[PDB]
């Protein structure tokens, strides 16, 4: 069956993917430019990630279409077109890892976040990461390639010239580089690291949203204890505890609260039980009017952070889902030489799926993040 029909389907699909990758990601980048509420450090990594996807459509996809033809080319030029996508995938990994870390900093140490994670430090990190991405992805160009052992029988059959090879990914890029260096070290390890960062993010969230609840219960149970108490010393016990739990909430209305606990304690230390109890009853007014509003705000903010962290995790998860099959196929090719090579149709499918990852991010932002969604609408409307 003529190779141009099988190759026609693959190519059309690649072109559809490129179109969509470019479109969606230009809109991400355009949204961040226009909306100042989307101008934060997290979103600069998002933009870097969008840039990489734009380049998959503009460059990586045309390169892959090109190399699918097996056209004659100087080996090192062939190399470049085979490996450029690795640079883009690496850049993406760095961006995803940074987003995970950024979100972890925001939830673990919100006090120090703004001064630690600035836009200036973020742009420097992005630049460094792009340089590193070029180094990792283009490592084969530094000598780890099969250009030294060309398939001359395959090159002579297609009438290639001197110094040229039939340009095919697996003929030029060593599988050991693909499996051990690229997959294990540069993809798998950073993905496992991301998994770990997200676990810590979700656990820290759980611990804080438990802690908020505990402190509130403490305030309410110590009120009851004070309400039915025998003497002044019991009242003093329950307000000494209450005081400490109000000062931790203030670090993590409060002027009034501590003050009122203090009023009650002085009375309690003078042996006046009924007066201490009545003064402690006034604490209820403060709890309703201020403290409960703080508990519910703080809770809301933590829920917003968990949601935003889930959205970022989904993105990282989708990268793994889209890229893993191609990596897994490479493992079979490398580790199992007695196994028949995965068919060309499957290679095409795995490649296309990897490329499809460059289309997905804009949809996740639209479905999961209000500010992006609202800005996408205005850009589209106008
Ligand atoms: C959830 C996602 C990440 C998992 C996807 C796993 C895919 C990539 C796995 C599942 C079954 C696997 C196939 C099982 C059997 C063979 C026959 C062998 O001669 C070549 C590899 C090949 C064809 C494997 C290629 C990879 C494969 C298709
Ligand atoms: C979920 C994460 C850890 C994904 C990474 C899992 C990868 C590395 C695993 C999953 C399935 C595994 C393959 C299963 C079967 C074979 C056939 C055997 O003859 C050689 C090893 C080989 C080819 C394995 C290599 C490693 C492999 C591809
Ligand atoms: C994190 C998880 C998913 C990794 C799982 C990797 C598993 C599937 C890998 C790790 C070590 C691998 C084995 C290592 C050695 C051999 C000998 C070879 O003659 C046949 C395949 C076989 C028997 C492999 C089968 C797949 C294997 C068991
Ligand atoms: C992490 C996953 C690592 C998986 C490593 C698999 C190695 C393997 O199967 O070797 C094949 C040879 O023994 C064939 O002789
Ligand atoms: C080739 C690769 C270039 C990729 C360029 C990546 C563009 C992203 C740059 C970016 O996000 O810059 C915002 C900066 O933080 C504002 O202070
Ligand atoms: C059809 C597009 C060209 C092409 C690209 C690739 C390719 O991009 C990879 C990659 N694997 C990873 C992990 C990242 S990229 C592999 C293993 O085989 C390929 C084989 C290819 O087709 C030929 C016949 O040359
Ligand atoms: C969309 C998935 C279907 C197209 C993927 C490429 C398959 C190419 C082929 O069938 O030769
Ligand atoms: C292709 C790369 C283009 C990415 C640069 C756009 C950044 C604008 C922005 O700040 O959102
Ligand atoms: C991380 C990758 C480490 C595993 C590489 C083993 C290399 C080998 O045994 O040939
Ligand atoms: C991740 C999911 C991977 C699941 C793959 C599991 C088993 C596939 C093994 C197929 C071996 C077929 C080749 C037989 C042979 O050696 O000739
Ligand atoms: C993860 C799921 C693991 C499933 C199967 C692992 C063993 C794969 C079978 C190896 C076949 C090698 C061969 O065909 O010689
Ligand atoms: C629809 C998704 C298609 C995915 C199929 C995964 C399994 C494909 C196995 C093909 C057999 C390859 C072989 O004969 O060597
Ligand atoms: Na990407």
Swiss-Prot record:
<feature type="transmembrane region" description="Helical; Name=3">
    <location>
        <begin position="79"/>
        <end position="101"/>
    </location>
</feature>
<dbReference type="GO" id="GO:0042755">
    <property type="term" value="P:eating behavior"/>
</dbReference>
<dbReference type="GO" id="GO:0007626">
    <property type="term" value="P:locomotory behavior"/>
</dbReference>
<dbReference type="GO" id="GO:0048786">
    <property type="term" value="C:presynaptic active zone"/>
</dbReference>
<feature type="topological domain" description="Extracellular">
    <location>
        <begin position="145"/>
        <end position="174"/>
    </location>
</feature>
<dbReference type="GO" id="GO:0098978">
    <property type="term" value="C:glutamatergic synapse"/>
</dbReference>
<keyword id="KW-1133">Transmembrane helix</keyword>
<comment type="subunit">
    <text>Interacts (via cytoplasmic C-terminal domain) with USP4; the interaction is direct. May interact with DRD4. Interacts with NECAB2. Interacts (via cytoplasmic C-terminal domain) with GAS2L2; interaction enhances receptor-mediated adenylyl cyclase activity.</text>
</comment>
<keyword id="KW-0832">Ubl conjugation</keyword>
<dbReference type="GO" id="GO:0006968">
    <property type="term" value="P:cellular defense response"/>
</dbReference>
<keyword id="KW-0325">Glycoprotein</keyword>
<dbReference type="GO" id="GO:0014074">
    <property type="term" value="P:response to purine-containing compound"/>
</dbReference>
<dbReference type="GO" id="GO:0008015">
    <property type="term" value="P:blood circulation"/>
</dbReference>
<dbReference type="GO" id="GO:0007200">
    <property type="term" value="P:phospholipase C-activating G protein-coupled receptor signaling pathway"/>
</dbReference>
<dbReference type="GO" id="GO:0035249">
    <property type="term" value="P:synaptic transmission, glutamatergic"/>
</dbReference>
<dbReference type="GO" id="GO:0007600">
    <property type="term" value="P:sensory perception"/>
</dbReference>
<dbReference type="GO" id="GO:0001609">
    <property type="term" value="F:G protein-coupled adenosine receptor activity"/>
</dbReference>
<dbReference type="GO" id="GO:0001973">
    <property type="term" value="P:G protein-coupled adenosine receptor signaling pathway"/>
</dbReference>
<dbReference type="GO" id="GO:0030673">
    <property type="term" value="C:axolemma"/>
</dbReference>
<dbReference type="GO" id="GO:0051968">
    <property type="term" value="P:positive regulation of synaptic transmission, glutamatergic"/>
</dbReference>
<dbReference type="GO" id="GO:0044877">
    <property type="term" value="F:protein-containing complex binding"/>
</dbReference>
<keyword id="KW-1003">Cell membrane</keyword>
<feature type="binding site">
    <location>
        <position position="355"/>
    </location>
    <ligand>
        <name>adenosine</name>
    </ligand>
</feature>
<dbReference type="GO" id="GO:0060079">
    <property type="term" value="P:excitatory postsynaptic potential"/>
</dbReference>
<feature type="transmembrane region" description="Helical; Name=7">
    <location>
        <begin position="344"/>
        <end position="367"/>
    </location>
</feature>
<feature type="disulfide bond">
    <location>
        <begin position="75"/>
        <end position="147"/>
    </location>
</feature>
<feature type="transmembrane region" description="Helical; Name=5">
    <location>
        <begin position="175"/>
        <end position="199"/>
    </location>
</feature>
<protein>
    <recommendedName>
        <fullName>Adenosine receptor A2a</fullName>
    </recommendedName>
</protein>
<dbReference type="GO" id="GO:0048812">
    <property type="term" value="P:neuron projection morphogenesis"/>
</dbReference>
<comment type="function">
    <text>Receptor for adenosine. The activity of this receptor is mediated by G proteins which activate adenylyl cyclase.</text>
</comment>
<dbReference type="GO" id="GO:0070374">
    <property type="term" value="P:positive regulation of ERK1 and ERK2 cascade"/>
</dbReference>
<keyword id="KW-0675">Receptor</keyword>
<dbReference type="GO" id="GO:0045938">
    <property type="term" value="P:positive regulation of circadian sleep/wake cycle, sleep"/>
</dbReference>
<keyword id="KW-0812">Transmembrane</keyword>
<dbReference type="GO" id="GO:0035810">
    <property type="term" value="P:positive regulation of urine volume"/>
</dbReference>
<dbReference type="GO" id="GO:0032279">
    <property type="term" value="C:asymmetric synapse"/>
</dbReference>
<dbReference type="GO" id="GO:0031000">
    <property type="term" value="P:response to caffeine"/>
</dbReference>
<dbReference type="GO" id="GO:0007188">
    <property type="term" value="P:adenylate cyclase-modulating G protein-coupled receptor signaling pathway"/>
</dbReference>
<dbReference type="GO" id="GO:0099171">
    <property type="term" value="P:presynaptic modulation of chemical synaptic transmission"/>
</dbReference>
<dbReference type="GO" id="GO:0006909">
    <property type="term" value="P:phagocytosis"/>
</dbReference>
<feature type="topological domain" description="Extracellular">
    <location>
        <begin position="336"/>
        <end position="343"/>
    </location>
</feature>
<dbReference type="GO" id="GO:0043116">
    <property type="term" value="P:negative regulation of vascular permeability"/>
</dbReference>
